[PDB]
Amino acid sequence: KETAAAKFERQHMDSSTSAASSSNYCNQMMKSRNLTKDRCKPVNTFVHESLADVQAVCSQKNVACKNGQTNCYQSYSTMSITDCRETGSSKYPNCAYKTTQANKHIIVACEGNPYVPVHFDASV
Ligand SMILES: O=c1ccn([C@@H]2O[C@@H](CN3CCCCC3)[C@H](O)[C@H]2O)c(=O)[nH]1
């Protein structure tokens, strides 16, 4: 069974590309990472940094999570990310997304032993 840490990697990690991300990127990635099976997942971010660098965020700036929990961490440096947002005309099963590349500080929730990212909270 898929661990929370593994689910985070599936939903949020894409170390393979530096940034770029073609206009097609989100359409392809949301589908291939299995985020379009149950529904069109409305909002999802992929991080283009090493797994070690993203895992390292769990020891960085402690900040409040959007849900009020205390286990979120903001990266000290900006990271290459791609936001995927479902378009207004997108209709399941044909999920359609706008692809937006940015360099921003990520905020992730961390849990477990080892203490690793399990949720992508925000970018700032
Ligand atoms: O900048 C982001 C922000 C959110 N997410 C996604 O949406 C988050 C939570 N969700 C958002 C609104 C509906 C109920 C709660 C998920 O934890 C995360 O997968 C991003 O991926 N990148």
XYZ file of N, CA and C and ligand atoms in Angstrom:
394
model
N 0.838 -1.236 0.000
C 0.000 0.000 0.000
C 0.857 1.264 0.000
N 0.331 2.315 -0.629
C 1.038 3.578 -0.793
C 1.095 4.362 0.514
N 2.314 4.643 0.967
C 2.529 5.476 2.149
C 2.238 6.940 1.815
N 2.032 7.745 2.855
C 1.804 9.178 2.701
C 2.990 9.848 2.005
N 4.200 9.441 2.385
C 5.432 9.953 1.771
C 5.493 9.628 0.277
N 5.157 8.385 -0.074
C 5.099 7.965 -1.476
C 4.024 8.722 -2.259
N 2.872 8.946 -1.624
C 1.779 9.686 -2.243
C 2.244 11.112 -2.547
N 2.959 11.721 -1.600
C 3.537 13.046 -1.836
C 4.468 13.053 -3.057
N 5.347 12.056 -3.152
C 6.251 11.956 -4.292
C 5.472 11.818 -5.610
N 4.432 10.985 -5.603
C 3.616 10.782 -6.799
C 2.873 12.060 -7.215
N 2.317 12.756 -6.234
C 1.484 13.918 -6.523
C 2.293 15.179 -6.773
N 3.478 15.280 -6.169
C 4.134 16.590 -6.074
C 5.589 16.692 -6.523
N 6.235 15.558 -6.787
C 7.644 15.575 -7.173
C 7.822 15.364 -8.673
N 8.558 16.265 -9.318
C 9.002 16.022 -10.698
C 10.402 16.569 -10.933
N 11.390 15.850 -10.413
C 12.794 16.255 -10.504
C 13.351 16.177 -11.927
N 12.663 15.434 -12.797
C 13.135 15.140 -14.161
C 13.312 16.350 -15.086
N 12.457 17.358 -14.935
C 12.609 18.603 -15.688
C 13.044 19.748 -14.773
N 13.842 20.662 -15.323
C 14.387 21.787 -14.565
C 13.306 22.801 -14.206
N 12.409 23.058 -15.156
C 11.359 24.059 -15.003
C 10.462 24.031 -16.224
N 10.973 24.606 -17.316
C 10.263 24.736 -18.588
C 8.771 24.438 -18.466
N 8.427 23.151 -18.571
C 7.046 22.672 -18.565
C 6.279 23.272 -19.735
N 6.079 22.471 -20.779
C 5.338 22.929 -21.954
C 3.888 23.252 -21.585
N 3.182 23.944 -22.477
C 1.752 24.200 -22.292
C 0.970 22.897 -22.089
N 1.535 21.783 -22.557
C 0.923 20.459 -22.402
C 1.200 19.799 -21.047
N 2.176 20.333 -20.312
C 2.739 19.672 -19.128
C 1.688 19.168 -18.138
N 0.836 20.065 -17.652
C -0.165 19.679 -16.651
C -1.177 18.666 -17.176
N -1.685 18.878 -18.388
C -2.565 17.883 -19.003
C -1.977 16.468 -18.954
N -0.695 16.345 -19.285
C -0.026 15.046 -19.316
C 0.296 14.522 -17.915
N 0.834 15.398 -17.068
C 1.277 15.012 -15.725
C 0.140 14.671 -14.771
N -0.937 15.450 -14.820
C -2.088 15.173 -13.962
C -2.668 13.792 -14.270
N -2.694 13.443 -15.555
C -3.145 12.130 -16.015
C -2.176 11.005 -15.611
N -0.891 11.167 -15.923
C 0.088 10.096 -15.692
C 0.368 9.809 -14.216
N 0.207 10.824 -13.368
C 0.377 10.647 -11.924
C -0.912 10.203 -11.238
N -1.909 9.859 -12.051
C -3.167 9.290 -11.573
C -3.976 10.267 -10.719
N -3.954 11.536 -11.122
C -4.703 12.585 -10.433
C -5.975 12.961 -11.193
N -6.316 12.172 -12.211
C -7.526 12.413 -13.011
C -8.447 11.184 -13.108
N -8.275 10.223 -12.200
C -9.038 8.970 -12.253
C -10.387 9.069 -11.533
N -10.370 9.548 -10.291
C -11.589 9.673 -9.483
C -12.389 10.906 -9.897
N -11.656 11.966 -10.231
C -12.199 13.253 -10.647
C -11.037 14.005 -11.290
N -11.273 15.225 -11.756
C -10.148 16.093 -12.097
C -9.701 16.758 -10.798
N -8.526 16.383 -10.284
C -7.984 17.066 -9.104
C -7.864 18.542 -9.483
N -8.525 19.430 -8.721
C -8.650 20.838 -9.123
C -7.342 21.644 -9.153
N -6.479 21.445 -8.157
C -5.241 22.223 -8.013
C -4.128 21.291 -7.554
N -2.980 21.354 -8.226
C -1.841 20.510 -7.856
C -0.516 21.086 -8.321
N 0.488 21.013 -7.453
C 1.813 21.567 -7.721
C 2.869 20.478 -7.829
N 3.726 20.602 -8.840
C 4.883 19.730 -9.016
C 6.149 20.523 -8.746
N 7.055 19.924 -7.979
C 8.307 20.566 -7.587
C 9.481 19.977 -8.376
N 10.236 20.856 -9.032
C 11.372 20.469 -9.879
C 12.684 20.714 -9.155
N 12.866 19.996 -8.059
C 14.103 20.021 -7.297
C 14.360 18.576 -6.916
N 15.548 18.293 -6.394
C 15.869 16.937 -5.960
C 14.991 16.527 -4.781
N 14.748 15.223 -4.652
C 14.020 14.704 -3.506
C 14.730 15.082 -2.209
N 16.059 15.001 -2.191
C 16.809 15.408 -1.004
C 16.537 16.871 -0.631
N 16.502 17.758 -1.625
C 16.249 19.185 -1.359
C 14.845 19.448 -0.807
N 13.858 18.719 -1.323
C 12.479 18.882 -0.855
C 12.329 18.259 0.543
N 12.883 17.066 0.738
C 12.886 16.447 2.067
C 13.549 17.355 3.123
N 14.601 18.064 2.714
C 15.341 18.974 3.594
C 14.462 20.107 4.137
N 13.382 20.428 3.420
C 12.472 21.499 3.839
C 11.846 21.190 5.206
N 11.719 19.907 5.547
C 11.159 19.510 6.852
C 11.994 19.952 8.059
N 13.209 20.443 7.803
C 14.088 20.957 8.858
C 14.316 22.468 8.702
N 13.517 23.090 7.840
C 13.650 24.523 7.538
C 12.663 25.406 8.338
N 12.050 26.423 7.733
C 11.289 27.400 8.530
C 9.914 26.879 8.942
N 9.725 26.641 10.241
C 8.445 26.135 10.758
C 7.394 27.243 10.658
N 6.285 26.941 9.977
C 5.170 27.872 9.807
C 3.843 27.152 10.013
N 2.803 27.910 10.339
C 1.480 27.312 10.509
C 0.956 26.774 9.178
N 0.352 25.584 9.216
C -0.357 25.030 8.058
C -1.686 25.744 7.882
N -2.194 25.751 6.653
C -3.496 26.349 6.367
C -4.616 25.785 7.244
N -4.513 24.510 7.621
C -5.537 23.883 8.460
C -5.355 24.135 9.957
N -4.334 24.913 10.309
C -4.069 25.239 11.703
C -3.106 24.325 12.438
N -2.717 23.217 11.814
C -1.682 22.364 12.391
C -0.342 23.098 12.368
N 0.598 22.625 13.181
C 1.873 23.314 13.390
C 3.041 22.675 12.642
N 2.753 21.673 11.819
C 3.822 20.868 11.211
C 4.151 21.218 9.765
N 4.040 22.497 9.423
C 4.415 22.930 8.078
C 5.750 23.641 8.073
N 6.420 23.599 6.925
C 7.773 24.129 6.788
C 7.905 24.829 5.451
N 8.476 26.028 5.495
C 8.704 26.833 4.301
C 10.169 26.761 3.894
N 10.421 26.517 2.608
C 11.793 26.443 2.097
C 12.505 27.799 2.240
N 13.776 27.778 2.649
C 14.546 29.016 2.789
C 14.848 29.627 1.421
N 15.008 28.773 0.416
C 15.247 29.240 -0.950
C 14.018 29.026 -1.813
N 13.880 29.833 -2.862
C 12.858 29.558 -3.866
C 13.172 28.233 -4.557
N 12.124 27.593 -5.053
C 12.256 26.351 -5.793
C 11.509 26.445 -7.108
N 11.991 25.700 -8.101
C 11.311 25.612 -9.381
C 10.069 24.740 -9.226
N 8.911 25.306 -9.556
C 7.639 24.589 -9.399
C 6.733 24.820 -10.599
N 5.766 23.929 -10.777
C 4.733 24.123 -11.780
C 3.389 23.936 -11.096
N 2.540 24.956 -11.175
C 1.166 24.838 -10.700
C 0.275 24.364 -11.831
N -0.620 23.437 -11.498
C -1.644 22.968 -12.419
C -3.011 23.313 -11.871
N -3.785 24.059 -12.654
C -5.111 24.485 -12.237
C -6.119 24.112 -13.308
N -7.158 23.381 -12.906
C -8.209 22.955 -13.831
C -8.878 24.163 -14.490
N -9.019 24.109 -15.817
C -9.659 25.182 -16.578
C -11.169 25.174 -16.348
N -11.807 26.308 -16.623
C -13.251 26.439 -16.471
C -14.060 25.540 -17.391
N -13.462 25.136 -18.511
C -14.154 24.331 -19.518
C -13.812 22.840 -19.432
N -12.889 22.498 -18.534
C -12.489 21.112 -18.310
C -13.666 20.258 -17.847
N -13.883 19.137 -18.530
C -14.955 18.209 -18.175
C -14.418 16.788 -18.053
N -14.458 16.252 -16.836
C -14.114 14.855 -16.576
C -14.858 13.962 -17.567
N -14.179 12.946 -18.138
C -12.813 12.452 -17.912
C -11.709 13.220 -18.650
N -12.092 14.200 -19.465
C -11.134 14.984 -20.247
C -10.626 16.173 -19.448
N -9.876 15.884 -18.392
C -9.405 16.928 -17.499
C -8.404 17.838 -18.198
N -8.657 19.140 -18.120
C -7.816 20.136 -18.782
C -7.275 21.141 -17.775
N -6.002 21.491 -17.942
C -5.259 22.292 -16.976
C -4.457 23.413 -17.610
N -4.372 24.525 -16.888
C -3.423 25.586 -17.189
C -2.104 25.274 -16.471
N -0.998 25.408 -17.202
C 0.344 25.142 -16.687
C 1.060 26.462 -16.376
N 1.428 26.669 -15.110
C 2.149 27.883 -14.714
C 3.435 27.559 -13.962
N 4.551 27.889 -14.600
C 5.873 27.745 -14.024
C 6.191 28.972 -13.174
N 6.803 28.739 -12.018
C 7.237 29.826 -11.146
C 8.430 29.387 -10.320
N 9.110 30.360 -9.724
C 10.108 30.086 -8.706
C 9.647 30.718 -7.410
N 9.276 29.862 -6.461
C 8.657 30.292 -5.213
C 9.133 29.443 -4.041
N 8.931 29.956 -2.828
C 9.183 29.181 -1.619
C 8.030 28.214 -1.454
N 8.338 26.944 -1.237
C 7.256 25.966 -1.011
C 6.983 25.797 0.479
N 5.744 25.438 0.803
C 5.370 25.106 2.167
C 4.786 23.693 2.152
N 5.407 22.797 2.912
C 4.964 21.395 2.982
C 4.689 20.989 4.427
N 3.790 20.027 4.612
C 3.553 19.430 5.927
C 4.391 18.174 6.025
N 5.055 18.005 7.170
C 5.913 16.843 7.397
C 5.433 15.988 8.550
N 5.626 14.677 8.410
C 5.217 13.709 9.418
C 6.127 12.508 9.394
N 6.107 11.767 10.494
C 6.698 10.437 10.547
C 8.123 10.347 11.047
N 8.611 9.113 11.093
C 10.015 8.834 11.335
C 10.464 7.833 10.275
N 11.241 8.301 9.276
C 11.830 9.641 9.173
C 10.805 10.750 8.929
N 11.189 11.980 9.259
C 10.313 13.144 9.131
C 10.395 13.651 7.709
N 9.339 13.406 6.944
C 9.353 13.674 5.505
C 8.076 14.381 5.041
N 8.112 15.007 3.844
C 6.896 15.671 3.365
C 5.766 14.698 3.077
N 4.567 15.059 3.529
C 3.376 14.250 3.270
C 2.240 15.059 2.616
N 2.366 16.386 2.601
C 1.313 17.260 2.048
C 1.974 18.495 1.457
N 1.466 18.958 0.318
C 1.909 20.233 -0.229
C 0.882 21.282 0.193
N 1.307 22.272 0.980
C 0.350 23.222 1.559
C 0.133 24.471 0.714
N 1.233 25.062 0.259
C 1.187 26.350 -0.436
C 2.526 26.685 -1.053
N 2.531 27.710 -1.896
C 3.776 28.337 -2.294
C 3.628 29.832 -2.064
N 4.730 30.485 -1.720
C 4.708 31.915 -1.426
C 5.906 32.623 -2.042
O -0.366 25.602 -4.035
C -1.018 24.574 -3.868
C -2.169 24.580 -3.085
C -2.892 23.398 -2.919
N -2.460 22.187 -3.517
C -3.245 20.916 -3.358
O -4.566 21.212 -2.807
C -4.367 21.025 -1.370
C -5.569 21.097 -0.378
N -6.893 21.440 -0.937
C -6.922 22.736 -1.655
C -8.324 23.384 -1.649
C -9.449 22.359 -1.437
C -9.249 21.556 -0.141
C -7.767 21.494 0.255
C -3.739 19.650 -1.386
O -3.127 19.280 -0.159
C -2.656 19.836 -2.420
O -2.590 18.564 -3.069
C -1.297 22.196 -4.303
O -0.882 21.174 -4.843
N -0.589 23.394 -4.476
